[PDB]
Every structure is written in C-alpha cells, then in structure tokens.
Subunit: 253 residues, 4 copies
C-alpha cells in the first residue's frame, strides 16, 4: 500500500477489462488514480467502489477531451506521475480484402494517435515529477496475427513509438515503456468470442494457446504496470511481455 504512495496516475480506458485491473493495482499501491473512459457505466461504478480513484469522462480521440483530462487532473491533485495508455480496440476478424483504408484510419486514431495525444499533453507535467509513460501494446504487434492487418499494424506502431519517445525523453528523466499482453480474459475477449460460430470452442482455443494453459487476468497486467512505474527505474524503452508464453515455440513441396 506504499510502493507508489503520493503519486497521481491516469489510466485511459480504465472502466473495464485490463484498464480496470490497472486502476485497481495502482490504488492498491497507494496512488491516486484518474479513470478516463468514453463510457460512463464501468468507470463511474469504479469511482464509487475505490477510495482514491475518480472518474473523468474522456474520449482519447477528441483532443479537447484529452486537454481537459490533463488540466482537471492537475487542478484536482496537483501533480501527474504516470500515464497508462490502455484505451484501444480489436475489431472483429477481417480478411485483408474485407478491410478499408477508412476503417484503418479510424483504428489508428484510437490505438495510436490517442496514445500520442495524451502523452504529448502530459509530458510537461511528467518532466516536473520525473514521471513515466506506460503504453499497452500487444504481442501480435511483434509476431503478427491472422485476420487483423489493421490491428496488428497499430500495435506495431505503438511498440516502436515507445522506443522513439524513450530516447527523446531520457535526457529529462522520463521513462517510457510498454506492456505487450497476450490473451487476457476481458469483456472485449468475451464480446469477440460471442461473434464466433462456436463461442465456447473459441474460448477453449484461446486458453490453450498459452503454454500456461489459461488466459491472463487484468490484475496480472496491472502488477506489471505498477512494477514499471514504481520499481523499474533503469528500464526505459522496453516491451514487457505478459503472454503466458504464447510466443515460445512453434513433405517439402
């Protein structure tokens, strides 16, 4: 309850799923947390549940929403120590010829440019606090996936951007790192599985895709985030895999 005491953290998409687990992990560490989400339902309930967490409605694709997010965080808590760029989306499976340039642009707006915009607006305050940035990317940005060309491209961009910004901000003492989760059991996972012909088979396949034989939990991503913020003081520009081992391991005509 003291590892990140006195610190102020913003978690985008913190109303459910991974983001809510990150929120819980930081509150449990002693931090005050600002839950950003475009949806009221989960984040408002989370603010009532957790002393030390508050909810601010904010769509990270709307620059003026993000400006107000940052200015309200400073107005209410007087400092900013860590930004967790978790808001993002995975579309349903799509064959390459079923994708569109305009759909790709929209997904870039959320998964890439919303992370960019909050980070840019927060960096002046992070420099004052010697704070840090944590981006939530994905394993499939590193190794690829099927029926997801736009999603994979956006996460490859997030991981690379993390390394570029780590270089730029290192002279000012601001660390920039990312987490690449694999299959984490969240409402997004549940929603996508429900679109499949056999949802229960899809979930079983998802569980067995990891050597550890289960999907991950939001709380496990949250523990990795608290580590990066509070104890990884010589880490910058890293990609922390939270995947259960999915990337490990695997007539001529």
């Amino acid at each position: 309850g003291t590892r990140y005491a006195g610190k102020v953290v913003v978690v985008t998409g913190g109303g459910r799923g991974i983001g809510a687990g990150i929120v819980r992990a930081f509150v449990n560490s002693g931090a005050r947390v600002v839950i950003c989400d475009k949806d009221e339902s989960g984040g408002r309930a989370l603010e009532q549940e957790l002393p030390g967490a508050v909810f601010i409605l904010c769509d990270v694709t709307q620059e003026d929403d993000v400006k107000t997010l940052v200015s309200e965080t400073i107005r209410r808590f007087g400092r900013l120590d860590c930004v967790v760029n978790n808001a993002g989306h995975h579309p349903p499976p799509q064959r390459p010829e079923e994708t569109s340039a305009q759909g790709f642009r929209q997904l870039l707006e959320l998964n890439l440019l919303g992370t960019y915009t909050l980070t840019k607006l927060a960096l002046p305050y992070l420099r004052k606090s010697q704070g840090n940035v944590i981006n939530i990317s994905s394993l499939v940005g590193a190794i690829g996936a099927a029926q997801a060309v736009p999603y994979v491209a956006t996460k490859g961009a997030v991981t690379a951007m993390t390394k570029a910004l780590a270089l730029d901000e290192s002279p000012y003492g601001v660390r920039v790192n990312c987490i690449s989760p694999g299959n984490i059991w969240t409402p997004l996972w549940e929603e996508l599985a429900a679109l499949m012909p056999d949802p229960r088979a899809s979930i079983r396949e998802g569980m067995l895709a990891q050597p550890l034989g289960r999907m991950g939990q939001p709380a496990e991503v949250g523990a990795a985030a608290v580590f990066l913020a509070s104890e990884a003081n010589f880490c910058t520009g890293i990609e922390l895999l939270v995947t259960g081992g999915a990337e490990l391991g695997y007539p001529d005509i």
Copy 2:
C-alpha cells in the same frame, strides 16, 4: 539476366534513391518493371535509360492513382508478380513537442496507408501468379531513433503489417516480406544532411554509425529485393536487415 525473367514488378517511389536501385536490380534480373513515382523528373529519365522499365506517374496516397497504376500494369504487361512498396519519407528531425497529430496522420498516409492500398489492389493479381510483396520498412522501426516519433511509429507499423499479411496470404501462396535498411546514401539522406548546422559532419557521423564504416547503396537494397522475390521461396513474414551492422552492440546515480 534470367533469375526473374518473364516477371512483372511494380516499384513505388522508383524515380530516385533506393527505389531506383531496386528498379535497376530487377531489370538486370530479366524482369519488366513499372516505375511508380509522384515526381516525373527521375522516373521519366529512368524509363528512357532502361529497356524493360516504363514510368507511370502515381501518388500512392491517392487511391484512384493506385487503381490506375494496377490496371495499366495489367493492360500493358498481362500479369503482376511482385510489388515493392518503397515510396516513403523521413521528415526533418523533430522533438516530440514539435510534432503534430495532423503531421503524424499525413506521414501515416504515405509510409503506411499507401503501402496498404497498393498491396490490397495488387493482391488478386499476385494470387494468380503466386507472386509476392516486398515492403521497405526501416531499422529504426525495430530499435527506435531520436527526434522522429512519427517516422519510427510508421515503420513499426509497416514491419508488423508485413507479418500479419504474410499469415493471411500464406494459404494462397503469396509471400509477404520486408527489408529494413539502415543508413543508405540517397537524395533524401543528402537533403536532410544539408539542413544540419554542419552537413559534412552529419554525413561523417552517418558513415561511422555502421561497423562496416560506410553507408549502404541503393544497389545493395536492390539485390536483397531480387533475392526475396526470386530465390526466397520458403521465406514469408521476415524482416531482412540491410544496415551494415548498425543494430549490433552498444557512476550508478
């Protein structure tokens, strides 16, 4: 002169620099080449110089330009075997706070979405020929760079997209690979160096950034592309580094 005989290749941004070297390499291999560029000057001269190469004016950010590029290639040569997505740009060095969301969007349009659009429109013809895609990414997408957050993000996206599409197109026999060059001596390199306080010092630094002690040549990228198209039949989804060893190698408070 026979390694890629009878084949038809499209090279975007083929009017100068790396793209022109790729054009030359494929002509030397026996292929017919379509030089795509938004600028007339270099590509028109290249078409007069090289029997087997022709020039088509096409801005890869304009979908109707790319549609006409593909339909004219098929109309004139009857098949399409390889697309080399080389068109791209590196902005001048920019601190993160000096970048803009709108500038980032524009660079994504060229470096990422123009590659996406040509590949999408070409894939029906590549499936008929069991052809292949070669994307020109960058080393800095993998390891980062300073004063280039948008550029690095776009190339991280290209490399990841390459792996996703390789998975999607493998059942149809179409390979999708990328080349990640390091410092290659091109007109873009010369133009950026000329913006520096000391251009000659900037070039010297660029030469010594590689263990091999020089910058690369467009012809060397071109040889790597001809290898991927004509001889790498068990390679798909790879990132071929052409960097001179730049990524190799490198009080407590």
Copy 3:
C-alpha cells in the same frame, strides 16, 4: 516486507555485486535466502548482516557442491520456491584470435552449465512449490559486443535455454524467466575498468552508453527479480531488459 513472505530463495554468486543486491531485495520482500558463492568473504558478512539470509559455500561448476547446496536448503528450510542463477564471469576484453577453445569451455562451465546443473537439481522441489527459475543473462547475448566472443556466446545460450525450459516446465506450473542487464556498477565492472589504459575514461564511457546517462545498480536488478518471482504469474520464458535503454537507437564505398 510481505510480497514474498514464507518463501525460500537460492541466489548463486550472491556474495557481492548483482547477486548481493538480489539477496537484499528478496530479504526485504520477506523471503528466506540462501547465499551461494565460491568465495567466503562477501557472503559470510552478508549472512551476519541480514536476518533471514544464510551463507553456503558452493562452486556452481562442481556438481557435488550443488547437490549439497540443494539438500542443505531443504534440510534447513523445508521448501524451495525460487532459484536465481546469477553466478557468472566476464573475462577481460579478448580479440577472437586471442581466445582459446579451452578458455571457451571453462566459461561455458560457469556461465551456462552451472545454471543448468542447479536448475536441474532444484526442479523437483520447484514443482512441489509451483516455484520459478530466474536466470541472469546479459544484453550482449541479444545484440552482441566486441572483444567478447565466448562471453556473448554463453549468454546467448542462457537466454535461449530459458525459453526451452519454460516450455518444458509449463505443464507443471513452474515459470522460467531471465533478466538481461546492461552496464551495472559492480566489483566486476570496477575490476575490468582497472585493467584499461585509462580506467576513469572507461567508466565514463560506460556511464554514457545508456540514454539514462548512468549505470544501473544491483538493487534495480534485484527489484526486477522480486517482480518475476512474486508478481509475474502470467510471465514465462521472457527476457526482462534492465539496461537503461542501451539497445535503443544507433560515403557509401
């Protein structure tokens, strides 16, 4: 003081440097720690200093020493939860033609096979406790280094071995991970620098090799180890970089 309470940890080479920092981190987390070292001096003093740590003289290249290490840990503390394979050595800088096959074999014995032997003898007890293995590898195993062919080869082997064993032990609930440090200020660093023509210049160069502008501390490696043991329950087979950003970032004839 409770994150790893009730747990028993063995740290090889725990008498000084990184190993001693790992020992301190685990004691501070609430664990009981067995300090293994071939040298009495530092580890004996550490055992007097730290309630909860004890010293066992053991050369990890001597199989019977390691057998007795494991059997004494179980005899004295009744369980084994985590093995940290930290013992290792970096020879002085050596040109490739100055190395020998026999020198290479000796370095493999310490850096690779001593890690293998302790892990093998500990695994039956780790399976009973659902414990975990943490190997201390090196950044240069991933990216290379000059004048160190044998050292680099041994650490490449440790990192790969970590992934293989993670796959083999995942069905039994035992996680296997590694830490790849960059420049950490330790007595080994101090000893190597003292062999250089200008030691102070060598240290200054070492500090500036990181974007963060300093070398790392043993305590920072220790915090990463405690994270992997106590909170990274969905991580197996990962390589956790603790390098200060050294791997980030960087006429044609």
Copy 4:
C-alpha cells in the same frame, strides 16, 4: 553460374541434408567447394557427381582435422572466400531431467565449438580475400522448443556468437552472418521421425507447423547462403530466417 565465380567455399557437414544443398548451390554459382564431413558415404559420391566440388574427411570436433582441412584447401585452391558452418546435430527429444551435463558438453562441442574452431583457423585467409562466414543456426535458438534444452542452448549460442564476431571482424572487411532454418526435410528429420510412435503423423505435423504448409528444402537454404556470400555486401551480424513463417502468430485461472 557466375555470381560467385573464382571463389573458394568450405561447407562443413556437406555430405547430405542442408549441407549438400548448400554445396550444390555454390557449385551452381561458379564457386569451387570443399565438402567437409565426418562420414565418407555422401560426400565422396557428391565429389564424383559435381565438377568443382571435392571431398575432405574432417570431424569438426577434432582440432587437428580442422587444421588440415584449412591447410589442404589453401594448398589445393590457393585462397579461401567463405566458410559455411553447417555441421551439427539434433538429439532425440529429451525431457530436461533426462538430459546430462556430459551430453550437453558433447553437443556444445559439435554445434558450437566446431563452428568456433573452423572460423578461427579460417579467419586469416578470409581477411586476405575479404571473405565471409555463414553459420547455420536454428529458429528454435530464438523462440525455444520443447524436449530440447541442450540443442536450443547451442543454437542460441551460435546466433549470439555470430553477432559478436561480426563486430570484431568488421574493421577487416569480413562479414559474419547466420541462417536460422525451421523445418527442413533432410535425413536428420527423417531419422528423428522414425523414432516416433507414429512417424507419418510426426511428419504431417511438421509440414503443417509452417503457414506455407510444407517443410523447406536444402536448396532453399543453399540459395540463402549464396545470397549472403555473393550479394549481401552491407549485411553483417544478421540472422536470416528460412522457416516458412513458423515464428509468425500463435478461463483465466
């Protein structure tokens, strides 16, 4: 037939499998080739078959054999341009507790130290010719595999060693690169499959482990080697994947 004309190449383990395909590729490129193997049967027949190839009996684990290999190559052909370190072995599948330190040492002798020894003895001649080294590593050194801790460790060592030596030899103009194959259909693959309960099922599984839906051919590894030797003049320290896409791609308790 001219890409590597006038050049002299040594291929270890060239009597069958991948090595024989590399031999054939270099002869087809115009080179003279020395086939090194510990076994007479395949290499002697290959020397009768191929004008331009000769056979020298040599066990790469025996330093005096390798000394004589190099001195006989120079005595017979007057130069040395490329060494392909292909000799190696994969043991039958072994659980970690079924391995031994002594078995691990023996596999290191072949897969790692035999590559080291030939490279060391050849480097003085490679510097005179501005020649190059090609090591045959494995995909599983990078991503791991099950029931193969020693094999995976040896190939992780080869890949890392490649990068270290590339740094050391770059000032002398000698490039050092590796190829990491995935499933290639060779006599070793056939022998291992025959030990399985259902050999035909094992082979079918091996074919489908690649997105491309088949195993690779020795000729495809050979084409990659000829590219690295003859056309990759700005590549050093790279790992060229020849895997068919195996590394691509893939309730909470």
